[model samples]
Target: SQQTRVLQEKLRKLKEAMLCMVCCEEEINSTFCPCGHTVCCESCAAQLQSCPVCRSRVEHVQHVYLPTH
Candidate 1:
């Protein structure tokens, strides 16, 4: 059931990304860049001065394995 669980979690993350306040796009979950605007995958939010949504770039990206509660 490990694969199933991972898939389910991925789906849940997609849902959350879809509901992101900045944009209505889903993140690939590659990286959660905090731009203070849109929470996009690293590829989408890479090397940006600010978030696409609020134009605020995070000084450092914090990675974690635990899902949000």
Candidate 2:
């Protein structure tokens, strides 16, 4: 079941990338413009002026669809 284990671990990592890096609770929903980085939800985006991943000036927080709920 090595292939299944590989897929299992990959699924875990993929979910990690989908979750908000800041809160680690909400799914990634807001994409900060200027840097075009999407790693936080609007909850964190409320007070964030700089992109969490890139540290660039965030001009706009755009809600992007990631083809999920």
Candidate 3:
């Protein structure tokens, strides 16, 4: 009888994998050099030392632009 249709909240905590290992918050949006591993966000990548994925030397941090889907 109303526009507000409340639904049952019986879902578990959304433990998604789309998170930065460094901060564990923001989504990973950078790719590591030499390894090409995209497992970190810009904030962490800026001061990243080595590649957390392949354990390779981080030569550069490439910013990845995710599609607006």
Q: Quick one: ranking by TM-score, best first? A: 2, 3, 1
Off by over 4 Å in 2: none
* Predictions in order: lDDT: 0.51, 0.86, 0.75
Q: Between prediction 2 and prediction 3, which has the larger TM-score? A: 2
Give the worst 10-residue stretch by lDDT in candidate 1.
Answer: 28-37
Model 1 C-alpha lDDT per residue in residues 1-69, reported as the tens digit of each score: 899999999998767764434344634333335543435554454554555555565565443332542
Model 3 lDDT tens row, 32-59? 9879988888999889788877789999
* Per-prediction TM-score: 0.36, 0.86, 0.69
Tens-place lDDT digits, model 2, residues 1-69: 899999999989988888888889999888899788888888998689888788899888998887864
Those runs of model 3 whose alpha carbons end farther than 4 Å from true positions after fitting are 1-15
Candidate 1 Cα outliers beyond 4 Å, as residue runs: 1-38, 64-69
lDDT head-to-head 2 vs 3, winner: 2
- What's model 1's lDDT at 40? 52
What is the RMSD, in Å, between candidate 1 and the native fold over all Cα? Answer: 8.0
